[PDB]
């Protein structure tokens, strides 16, 4: 529905969602946006209530600004928070290699304090990181990608703690103010007070409490019952806040004349210093959140308060003791209890500006924390709002930040969603964040909540799962890093047709209704009783009659990627998420196809590619051609909207962007306009709805073995091309520099008879390996040779030159046609790194025509190598001739799970083949229901279904029974799954019926050349001359130690030894036997651990002398 | 080096002669520095580039 270019992949909606697809993607941006704070977002936020939100900026400004000296006589302030505007299709930078950005102006204002005066100055600030419609930032035509680090909400937090000693429940809580130090109270073993602050032994609190002014009375009074503390007033022995205080204070420093400071100053400072003591408003906010506190209090500050301090303290006491709720004076009550890290309300998440903002923050700070410095020194008088500016270091970082911004991580432009996934991708680790070398599984741990939060399934994978992820599906997330699941907030067998974005918490209080659930068409789930998670998410049954809220659909904590394959309910999650991640590693070959089957996700998902040239106006078409297309913006109005092609990925792939229609036709904004990449008929082309079947065969689909057609070739089905950029600079240095001529020493002809006038050939030109390349050259040196030579040269007049004959030449597995020409000169002004005056970068096609053996696959994780190629003929094949797509061993699924593969595929041939319900007279019962409408399948046509919703077996099965028998109204197929092809070879019948079908799959960014290597020899650590592994190099595989042990298990000695010597780095035998070799002869028998020799020396060295004899 | 600077040095002192202390000072100082040779802050403040 709601789809301009809509077809219909007819699905199986047994259900309904009034709700509809959010926009995801939005995300950050918005932030950014908000961070910015556009009168957009401004409007945005602005709407949906929202008092006085603020572009993540200001703030900045005001969180410091305005300004002033320490002399209290020069007053600066700010203003004009804002920017200018970019200067490119970005696309420009893209090509133009720089990054995309737009200038910043802002208008602070200094003011004397003496006279007090005026120094505004709408100062420029910075051209700036300018996002993308992809909501992104492709530094210098080059973007990484940032995800947010999950972050359990900071704050003073609570628990019981037992002591096997006595087992007593020394509960407690910390304090953790942003940037504010620490200080914590803790159910003492023996009486009483988990006093000490951010690591200071312990005290009698009140010494601090009283220390601020507290008659031991006042407490006991308000705090005698409240007896354990009474002990505190006991052992507290010492008195006089001050007496303490100062004494404390020593407890602080320690050792120092307790000046009144000791009596207060820093103390307050310490944590009454929003000057520096600076928790988090949201926390701040929290806080109240903690405890129905001031609450009625649109507040904001680091305003520490002994007030609440003690408050929650006696909270402690009251609890350790067991006590439900209770209301502090005024402060409405709170049911007592510890806390949790685990749950997610415990647990916010970060976001750009936020970051940024932090970054930046110090940035100014920094750069800021200077004018101060200078402010002063910067004599009064003529010292303009300018005079003292220099954000430079800011962007320096900032800018920089990206450099280092390890979390910005180059968008794997391998497929769309893949890139997506990358988007929504989410963890909580790294810079300042965790260091997996320190985190208990729990980190990875499951837990209830979780639903409607992030794909249960997917995750990292190596030592990595339970560490990272994304969102679930819908539920937006807090203006403060917390999900926003709306719900079927039910009402009296009549759910309240109503979103309710929810932070798990709260909520937690509430009643877990069930999607997939039969209402009396009214909310009135027709049963009296139901189930539902409870306090512990206690997925508990119950009488329908009682919940507050149901849900928002089925399937939600899901991921998109998650959201992708049915039969789940039959299939290994392991295997699953496996396929999940898998999913991505398709490889947009060429053909473009969609599984005739597949849910709705799909392009409606894919649309969220938001990539395809896609309508902008109900305009009629206009001129068209594969670069763009003029667009009759029917307001007269037009715009030859463009279209890209032949431009590499992060992974070597075109810019292709295939059209749709006709320069004359007529259509309307937002509707499609032209695919391109992973973009089958407006849709991730992703595989091949492909026959094949069931046998494990002649041992070739065995142990992962895999048996594969061939026609394929021919068919071509399997290829695209791939892209290196091809670079090689012209440099500058000692003996001269790095020329790029075309002349060359005793170079072959043609070898040159090929390049351009002065080096490399010309675009779209074919090659191979070795193939020389550049037109480079460099001075050689100056250190004589043997007369012998020269002489020799005199002998052959080959009057040698003297220049470091230098250039480039094609390595291995390499060919195609000329492309790149990023020949960019320093000298030609083309800014570039030192000692260089230019550089080109180039590209070449190569259509990868799919080797067998390799690996592909599709849904049901159901990965699959690519064993053998196999000619057509020679092939089991329709009794109607037509043979397989390939075949399939058995076995795994059993010990695996994923049989939908089976079903789905049944299905496959089905759809692929269509049918019609011959319900006629009446009803296929199992029919008697369901998307009726179908009734049939026009042999082969569009077919989707819901996730946790779709027809059934029997049905499905019975669907089997159903049919669109072929030409000869035939169905070699059995209402059964197993027919009986014969042999494209020997040919005869088979033993028994033949299970078979079809399956779209996908193809792999992982094969030989990805990893096709060894190494005969090459470079060698100018230090530990080991195989200098490298590009030019094959690396030359390293070796293991066990291994060695293996030897041992034999003792080939030598062998190993040898190694150690040889290929290890036997300078000699390397040379030496290398010779031998060269001379092929009873090899220079293994010598001596040489070096080892060193040792000795090495020893001696320390008076160490000794010896064997 | 260092050493060299030293034996060369407080050595080269010798020769001259004076309230030794001086020499002691180095001397040990040397020793030390040596030791350093042996290992660094192994004793006391390890030297650090």
């Amino acid at each position: 529905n709601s789809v301009p270019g809509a077809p219909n992949r007819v699905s199986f909606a047994k259900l309904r969602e009034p709700l509809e697809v959010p926009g995801l993607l939005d995300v950050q941006t918005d932030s950014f946006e908000w961070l910015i704070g556009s009168p957009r977002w401004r409007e945005s936020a602005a709407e949906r209530g929202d008092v006085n939100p603020v572009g993540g900026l200001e703030e900045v400004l005001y969180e410091l600004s305005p300004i002033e000296d320490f002399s209290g006589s020069m007053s600066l302030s700010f203003s004009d928070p804002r920017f200018d505007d970019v200067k490119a299709p970005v696309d420009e930078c893209k090509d133009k290699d720089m990054t995309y950005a737009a200038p910043l102006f802002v208008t602070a204002e200094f003011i004397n304090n003496n006279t007090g005066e005026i120094k505004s100055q709408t100062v420029f600030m910075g051209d700036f990181p300018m996002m993308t419609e992809k909501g992104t930032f492709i530094i210098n035509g080059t973007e990484r990608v940032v995800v947010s680090q999950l972050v359990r909400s900071p704050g003073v937090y609570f628990d019981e703690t037992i002591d096997k000693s006595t087992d007593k429940t020394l509960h407690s809580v910390k304090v953790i103010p942003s940037r504010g130090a620490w200080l914590e109270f803790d159910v003492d073993k023996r009486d009483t007070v988990g006093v000490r602050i951010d690591r200071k032994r312990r005290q009698p609190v009140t010494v601090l409490l009283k220390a601020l002014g507290w008659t031991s009375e006042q407490i006991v009074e308000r705090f005698g019952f409240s007896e354990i503390m009474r002990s505190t007033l006991e052992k507290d022995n010492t008195v006089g806040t001050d007496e303490a205080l100062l004494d404390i204070y020593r407890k602080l420093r320690p050792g120092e004349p307790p000046t009144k400071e000791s009596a207060q100053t820093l103390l307050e400072n310490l944590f009454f210093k929003e000057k520096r003591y600076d928790l988090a408003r949201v926390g701040r906010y929290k806080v109240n959140k903690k405890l129905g506190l001031h609450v009625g209090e649109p507040i904001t500050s680091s305003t520490l308060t002994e007030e609440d301090v003690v408050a929650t303290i006696e909270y402690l006491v009251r609890l350790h003791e067991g006590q439900t709720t209770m209301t502090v004076p005024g402060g409405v009550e709170v049911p007592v209890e510890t806390d949790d890290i685990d749950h997610f309300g415990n647990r916010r998440l970060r976001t750009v500006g936020e970051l940024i903002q932090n970054q930046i923050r110090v940035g100014m700070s920094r750069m800021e924390r200077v004018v101060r410095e200078r402010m002063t020194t910067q004599d009064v008088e003529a010292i303009t709002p300018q005079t003292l500016i220099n954000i430079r270091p800011v962007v320096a970082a900032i800018k920089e930040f990206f450099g280092t911004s390890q979390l910005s991580q180059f968008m794997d432009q391998n497929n769309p969603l893949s890139g997506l996934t990358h988007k929504r991708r989410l963890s909580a680790l790294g810079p300042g964040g965790l260091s997996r070398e320190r985190a208990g599984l729990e980190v990875r741990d499951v837990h209830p909540s979780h639903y409607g939060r992030m794909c249960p399934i997917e995750t990292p994978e190596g030592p990595n799962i339970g560490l990272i992820g994304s969102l679930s599906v819908y539920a937006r997330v807090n203006p403060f890093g917390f999900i926003e699941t709306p719900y079927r907030k039910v009402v009296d067998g009549v759910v309240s047709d109503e979103i309710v974005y929810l932070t798990a918490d709260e909520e937690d209080r509430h009643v877990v209704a069930q999607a997939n659930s039969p209402i009396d068409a009214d909310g009135r789930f027709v049963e009296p009783r139901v189930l539902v998670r409870r306090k512990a998410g206690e997925v508990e049954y119950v009488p329908s009659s009682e919940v507050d809220y149901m849900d928002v659909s089925p399937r939600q904590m899901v991921s998109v990627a998650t959201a992708m394959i049915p039969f789940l309910e039959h299939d290994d999650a392991n295997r699953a998420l496996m396929g999940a991640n898998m999913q991505r590693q398709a490889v947009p070959l060429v053909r473009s196809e969609a599984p005739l089957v597949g849910t709705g996700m799909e392009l409606r998902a894919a649309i969220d590619a938001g990539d395809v040239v896609v309508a902008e106006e109900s305009g009629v078409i206009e001129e068209v051609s594969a670069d763009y297309i003029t667009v009759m913006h029917d307001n007269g109005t037009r715009r030859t909207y463009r279209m890209r092609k032949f431009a590499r990925s992060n992974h070597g792939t075109c810019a292709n962007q295939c059209p749709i229609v006709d320069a004359g036709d007529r259509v309307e904004a937002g509707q499609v306009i032209a695919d391109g990449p992973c973009t089958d008929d407006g849709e991730m082309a992703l595989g091949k709805n492909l026959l094949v079947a069931i046998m494990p065969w002649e041992g070739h689909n065995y142990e992962d073995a895999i048996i594969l057609s061939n026609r394929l070739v021919e068919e071509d089905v399997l290829t695209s091309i791939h892209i290196e950029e091809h670079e090689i600079d012209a440099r500058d240095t000692k003996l001269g520099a790095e020329e790029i001529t075309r002349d060359i020493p005793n170079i072959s002809d043609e070898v040159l008879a090929d390049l351009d006038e002065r080096g490399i050939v010309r675009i779209g030109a074919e090659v191979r390996d070795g193939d020389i390349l550049v037109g480079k050259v460099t001075p050689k040196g100056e250190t004589e040779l043997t007369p012998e030579e020269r002489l020799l040269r005199a002998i052959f007049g080959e009057k040698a030159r003297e220049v470091r004959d230098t250039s480039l030449k094609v390595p291995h597995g390499e060919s195609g046609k000329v492309i790149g020409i990023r020949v960019f000169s320093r000298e030609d002004e083309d800014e570039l790194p030192a000692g260089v005056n230019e550089l080109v970068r180039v590209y070449v096609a190569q259509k990868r025509k799919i080797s067998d053996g390799d690996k592909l696959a599709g849904r049901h994780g159901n990965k699959g190598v690519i064993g053998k190629i196999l000619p057509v003929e020679d092939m089991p094949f329709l009794a109607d001739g037509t043979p397989v797509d390939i075949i399939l061993n058995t076995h795994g699924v059993p010990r695996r799970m994923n049989i939908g593969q089976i079903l789905e595929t049944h299905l496959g041939w089905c759809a692929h083949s269509g049918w019609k319900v011959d319900a006629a007279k009446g009803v296929p019962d199992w029919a008697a229901r369901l998307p009726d409408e179908l009734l049939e399948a026009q042999p082969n046509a569009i077919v989707s279904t819901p996730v946790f919703d779709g027809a059934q077996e029997a049905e499905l099965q019975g669907l089997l029974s159903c049919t669109l028998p072929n030409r000869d109204g035939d169905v070699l197929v059995d209402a059964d799954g197993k027919a009986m092809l014969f042999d494209g070879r020997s040919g005869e019948p088979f033993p028994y019926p033949v299970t078979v079908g079809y399956m779209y799959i996908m193809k792999l960014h992982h094969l030989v050349d990805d990893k096709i290597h060894a190494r005969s020899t090459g470079p060698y650590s100018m230090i530990t001359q080991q195989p200098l592994g490298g590009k030019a190099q094959f690396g030359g595989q390293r070796f293991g130690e066990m291994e060695c042990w293996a030897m041992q298990a034999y003792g080939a000695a030598y062998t190993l030894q040898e190694l150690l010597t040889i290929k290890s780095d036997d300078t000699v035998g390397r040379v030496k036997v290398y010779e031998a070799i060269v001379k092929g002869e009873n090899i220079p028998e293994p010598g001596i651990p040489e070096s080892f020799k060193v040792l000795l020396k090495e020893l001696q060295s320390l008076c160490l002398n000794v010896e064997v004899l | 080096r260092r050493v060299i600077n030293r034996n060369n040095r407080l050595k080269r002192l010798i020769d001259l002669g004076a309230p030794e202390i001086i020499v002691n000072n180095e001397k040990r100082m040397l020793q030390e520095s040596v030791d350093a040779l042996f290992d660094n802050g192994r004793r006391g403040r390890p030297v650090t580039g």
Binding site: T192, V193, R196, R201, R202, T232, E234, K235, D236 | G44
Partner: peptide, 24 residues
């Protein structure tokens, strides 16, 4: 008595040894 406990021990060495550092 609102003292946690092992200020000594630790503080007593790091004091002690600390001195020891004063040997350098």
């Amino acid at each position: 008595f609102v003292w946690d406990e092992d200020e000594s021990e630790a503080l007593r060495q790091a004091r002690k040894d600390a001195e020891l550092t004063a040997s350098a």
